Write a protein that binds this ligand. Structure first.
Ligand SMILES: O=c1ccn([C@@H]2O[C@H](COP(=O)(O)OP(=O)(O)O)[C@@H](O)[C@H]2O)c(=O)[nH]1
Ligand SMILES: O=c1ccn([C@@H]2O[C@H](COP(=O)(O)OP(=O)(O)O)[C@@H](O)[C@H]2O)c(=O)[nH]1
Ligand SMILES: [Mg+2]
Ligand SMILES: [Mg+2]
Ligand SMILES: [Mn+2]
Ligand SMILES: [Mn+2]
Lengths: 249, 249
């Protein structure tokens, strides 16, 4: 296998854990040759970590509240940024030479191992402000150096919405104007879920359920096989019910 | 002056004419050294053309209903596409070596003559599907060849929404993946009118009132100096009342 490269996702709770299980299961379904990693916190229940270990190759515990954690000092300056400081540990994974970070609210529809042809920092434009890249799917190179610099920036600048996108766009500020090969096609992070979707949505590789209501916040009804287009939402729930639930033997 | 280069806009009626007057007036305010051109149709009233001649250097009449018009045969195949076939005449203006097309629902906030450093086809990403460029602001090279090919594509493919963006994106299909210098910064076509705008909206060069309701569809009240943020909307109306109305001596 490519033991040197991984898909890396994050969950700080049992709800986003359901996302990660669907993401990981979807990467396996499309036969990734790379490792699957999930960053998890002590807020994820032991019982959920046991399920995550059935999908992920590594469940890596990160606890920013631990005084021995690399991000703990930054957290005392910015106590509102625990989730994003947890996310930033993706750069601490120096056992890998290259990774694709994916949000736990994403879902893979095709093999996307060709993302490992890209260099740090390759990412898709954010709908709404497309000179910024969306931080939900990105190719990067773990580095303690880069990690510490992102921590400093988080300390200095903070994050109005608690997300990492501003910080990552501030650090990787040449993305908009430099090297078109670092622009991932939008189909690798399809996040604006009429006429553009009717022509190109069929070729989506990754769906991103960006925004307030996540697929797992819906109530699924087996009797109608529907939540109470929801095309993508139905596919999420199809993977969950078909591929995830039976991992619980 | 740069008699060889122009800003080119379009109006097929008196309502969008008000847009063009505000756009043209804004380009003059920021001291363009280029020519100002408006493509107009016989549906624009003579009285409005007289006002347009006070702002524009050239009011160029285009009538796709005239059997001598270059786009007339295409219109008989696609009678629903009169406006976009009118727009496509922007490529017939071979008296200019290079032009910036701007929609009549745009407004300039700074000198943007440095767009003439760009090559065809340079355009900003469309919010919502950012691997397509928005066809409301673009750098191009007039050519009868290119014109005829866009006409053919319009004939072959049509336009579901009546706009030209699909056609232009189909013809200039390498835009997303090739030559980052052909990606205009989003501030040259700021069309998604909270946190990204709070950091970068102040540096906007062009505002685009993309979507259903246009600034001139609002009712302005002098007693409150408001329509019945609307920051951009207020600036539109400020240019209209301050700079446009008094051109009517
Ligand atoms: O309470 C939270 C909030 C977010 N996340 C992680 O952070 C990512 C970014 O958050 P989200 O996708 O909700 O942001 P959006 O994509 O909606 O802006 C998620 O996918 C998760 O991987 C998490 O683990 N716990
Ligand atoms: O009836 C019309 C519709 C559109 N236009 C022109 O076509 C451009 C594109 O239309 P619009 O800006 O309304 O499309 P949007 O930017 O909202 O998608 C306008 O700015 C005008 O220049 C026109 O002259 N008459
Ligand atoms: Mg510093
Ligand atoms: Mg043909
Ligand atoms: Mn997300
Ligand atoms: Mn427009």
């Amino acid at each position: 296998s490519m033991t040197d490269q991984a898909f890396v996702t994050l969950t700080t709770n049992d709800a986003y854990a359901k996302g990660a299980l669907v993401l990981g299961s979807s990467l396996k379904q499309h036969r990734t040759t790379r490792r699957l990693v999930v960053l998890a916190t002590p807020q994820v229940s032991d019982s959920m970590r046991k399920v995550l270990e059935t999908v992920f190759d590594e469940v890596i515990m990160v606890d920013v509240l631990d005084s021995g954690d690399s991000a703990h000092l930054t957290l005392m300056k910015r106590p509102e940024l625990g989730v994003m400081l947890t996310k930033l540990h993706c750069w601490s994974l120096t056992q890998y030479s290259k990774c694709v970070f994916m949000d736990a609210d994403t879902l893979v529809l095709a093999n996307i191992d060709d993302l490992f042809d890209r260099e740090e920092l390759s990412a898709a434009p954010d709908p709404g402000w497309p000179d910024c890249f969306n931080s939900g799917v990105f190719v990067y190179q773990p580095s303690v150096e880069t990690y510490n610099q992102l921590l400093h920036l988080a300390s200095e600048q903070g994050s109005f919405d608690g997300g990492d996108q501003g910080i990552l766009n501030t650090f990787f500020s040449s993305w908009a104007t430099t090297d078109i090969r670092k622009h991932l096609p939008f189909i690798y992070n399809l996040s604006s879920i009429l006429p553009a979707f009717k022509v190109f949505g069929a070729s989506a590789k990754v769906v991103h359920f960006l925004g307030r209501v996540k697929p797992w916040n819906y109530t699924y009804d087996p009797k109608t096989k529907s939540v109470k287009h929801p095309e993508f939402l139905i596919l999420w729930w199809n993977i969950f019910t078909t591929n995830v639930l039976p991992l619980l033997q």
